Each structure stands twice: as structure tokens, then as C-alpha cells.
PQR file with spaces between the fields and no chain letter, atoms N, CA, C, O and H, PARSE charges and radii, in Angstrom:
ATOM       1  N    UNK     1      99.768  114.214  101.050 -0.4000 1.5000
ATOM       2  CA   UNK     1     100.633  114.236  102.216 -0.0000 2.0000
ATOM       3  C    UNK     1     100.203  113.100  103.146  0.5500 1.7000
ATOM       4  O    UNK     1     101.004  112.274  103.583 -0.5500 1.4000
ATOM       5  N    UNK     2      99.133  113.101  103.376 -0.4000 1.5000
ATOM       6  CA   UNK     2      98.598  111.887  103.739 -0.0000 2.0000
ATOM       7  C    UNK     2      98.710  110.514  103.884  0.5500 1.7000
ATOM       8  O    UNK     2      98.681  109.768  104.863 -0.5500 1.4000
ATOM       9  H    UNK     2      98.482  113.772  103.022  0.4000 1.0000
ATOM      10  N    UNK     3      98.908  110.263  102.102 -0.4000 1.5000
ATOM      11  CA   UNK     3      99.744  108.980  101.930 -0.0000 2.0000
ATOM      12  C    UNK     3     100.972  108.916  102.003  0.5500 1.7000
ATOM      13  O    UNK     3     101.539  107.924  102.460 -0.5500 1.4000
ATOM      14  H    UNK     3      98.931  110.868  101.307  0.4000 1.0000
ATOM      15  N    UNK     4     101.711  110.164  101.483 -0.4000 1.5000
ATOM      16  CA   UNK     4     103.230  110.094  102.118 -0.0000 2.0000
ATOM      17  C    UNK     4     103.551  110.148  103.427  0.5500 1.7000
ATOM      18  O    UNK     4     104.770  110.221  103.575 -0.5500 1.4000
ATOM      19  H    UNK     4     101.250  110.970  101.112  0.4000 1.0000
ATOM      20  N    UNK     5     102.848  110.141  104.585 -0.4000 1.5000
ATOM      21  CA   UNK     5     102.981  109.887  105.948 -0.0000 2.0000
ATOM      22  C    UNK     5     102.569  108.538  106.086  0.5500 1.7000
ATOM      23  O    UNK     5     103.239  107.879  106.881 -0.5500 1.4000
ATOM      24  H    UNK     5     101.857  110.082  104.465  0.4000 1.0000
ATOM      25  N    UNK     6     101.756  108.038  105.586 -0.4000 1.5000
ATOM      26  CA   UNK     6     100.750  106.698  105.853 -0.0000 2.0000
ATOM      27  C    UNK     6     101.803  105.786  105.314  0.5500 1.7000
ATOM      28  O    UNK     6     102.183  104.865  106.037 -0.5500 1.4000
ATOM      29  H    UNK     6     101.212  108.573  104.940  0.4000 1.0000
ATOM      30  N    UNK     7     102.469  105.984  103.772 -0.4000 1.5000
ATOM      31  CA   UNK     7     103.918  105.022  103.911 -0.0000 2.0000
ATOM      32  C    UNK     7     104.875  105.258  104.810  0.5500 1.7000
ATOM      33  O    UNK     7     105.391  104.305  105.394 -0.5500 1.4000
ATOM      34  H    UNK     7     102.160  106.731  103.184  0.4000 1.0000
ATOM      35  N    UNK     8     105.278  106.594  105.074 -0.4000 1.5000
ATOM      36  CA   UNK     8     106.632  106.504  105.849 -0.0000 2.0000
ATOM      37  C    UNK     8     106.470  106.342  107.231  0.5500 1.7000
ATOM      38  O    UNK     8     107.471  106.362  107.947 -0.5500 1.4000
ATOM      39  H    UNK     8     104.859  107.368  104.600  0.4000 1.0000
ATOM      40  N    UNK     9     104.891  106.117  107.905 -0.4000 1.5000
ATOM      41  CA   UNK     9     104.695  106.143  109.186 -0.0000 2.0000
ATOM      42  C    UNK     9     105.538  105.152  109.621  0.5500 1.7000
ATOM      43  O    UNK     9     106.372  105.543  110.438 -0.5500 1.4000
ATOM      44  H    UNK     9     104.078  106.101  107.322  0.4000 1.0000
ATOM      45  N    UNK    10     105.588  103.742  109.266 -0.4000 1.5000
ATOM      46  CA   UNK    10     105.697  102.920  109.680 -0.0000 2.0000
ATOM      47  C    UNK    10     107.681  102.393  110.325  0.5500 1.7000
ATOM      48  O    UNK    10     108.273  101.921  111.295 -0.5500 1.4000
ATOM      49  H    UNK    10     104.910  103.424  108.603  0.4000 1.0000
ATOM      50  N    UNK    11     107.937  102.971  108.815 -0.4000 1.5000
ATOM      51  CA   UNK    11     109.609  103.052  108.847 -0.0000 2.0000
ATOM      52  C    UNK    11     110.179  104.300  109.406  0.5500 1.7000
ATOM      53  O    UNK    11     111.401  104.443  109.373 -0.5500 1.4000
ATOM      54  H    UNK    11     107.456  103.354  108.027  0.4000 1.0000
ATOM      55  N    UNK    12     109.345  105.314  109.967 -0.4000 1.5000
ATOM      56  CA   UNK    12     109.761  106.403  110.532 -0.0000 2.0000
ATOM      57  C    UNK    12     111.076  105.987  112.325  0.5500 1.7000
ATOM      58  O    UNK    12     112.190  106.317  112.731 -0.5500 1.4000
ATOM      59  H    UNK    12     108.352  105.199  109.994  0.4000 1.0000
ATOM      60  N    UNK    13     110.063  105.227  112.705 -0.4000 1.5000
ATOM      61  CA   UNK    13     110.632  104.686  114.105 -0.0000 2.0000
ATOM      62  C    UNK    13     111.452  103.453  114.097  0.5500 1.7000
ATOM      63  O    UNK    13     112.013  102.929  115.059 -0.5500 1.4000
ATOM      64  H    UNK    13     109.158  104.959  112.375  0.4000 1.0000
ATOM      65  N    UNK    14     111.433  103.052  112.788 -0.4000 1.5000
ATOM      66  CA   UNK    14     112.448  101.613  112.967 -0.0000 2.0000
ATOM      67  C    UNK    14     113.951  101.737  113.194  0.5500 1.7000
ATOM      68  O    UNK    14     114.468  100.878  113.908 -0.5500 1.4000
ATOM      69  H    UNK    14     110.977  103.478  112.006  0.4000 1.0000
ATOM      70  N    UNK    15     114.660  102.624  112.717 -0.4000 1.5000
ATOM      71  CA   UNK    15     116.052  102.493  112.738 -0.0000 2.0000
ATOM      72  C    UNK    15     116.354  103.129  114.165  0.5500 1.7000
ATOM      73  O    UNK    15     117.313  102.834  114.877 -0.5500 1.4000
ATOM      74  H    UNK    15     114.240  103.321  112.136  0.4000 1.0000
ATOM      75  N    UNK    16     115.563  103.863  114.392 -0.4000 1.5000
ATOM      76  CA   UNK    16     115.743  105.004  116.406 -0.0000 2.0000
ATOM      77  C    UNK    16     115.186  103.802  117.255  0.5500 1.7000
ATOM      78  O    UNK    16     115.075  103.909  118.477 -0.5500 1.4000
ATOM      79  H    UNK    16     114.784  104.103  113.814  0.4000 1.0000
């Protein structure tokens, strides 16, 4: 879960 947050952290806030 970890790494699936640690990739999507980044693109989480880009499109908002």
C-alpha cells in the first residue's frame, strides 16, 4: 500500500 500511495502521491493533486 505503501508503494501504491508513493506512485499515486504525486498525480493525486495534479488534475484538482
Amino acid at each position: 500500500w505503501i508503494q501504491x500511495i508513493t506512485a499515486l502521491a504525486p498525480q493525486a493533486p495534479a488534475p484538482f
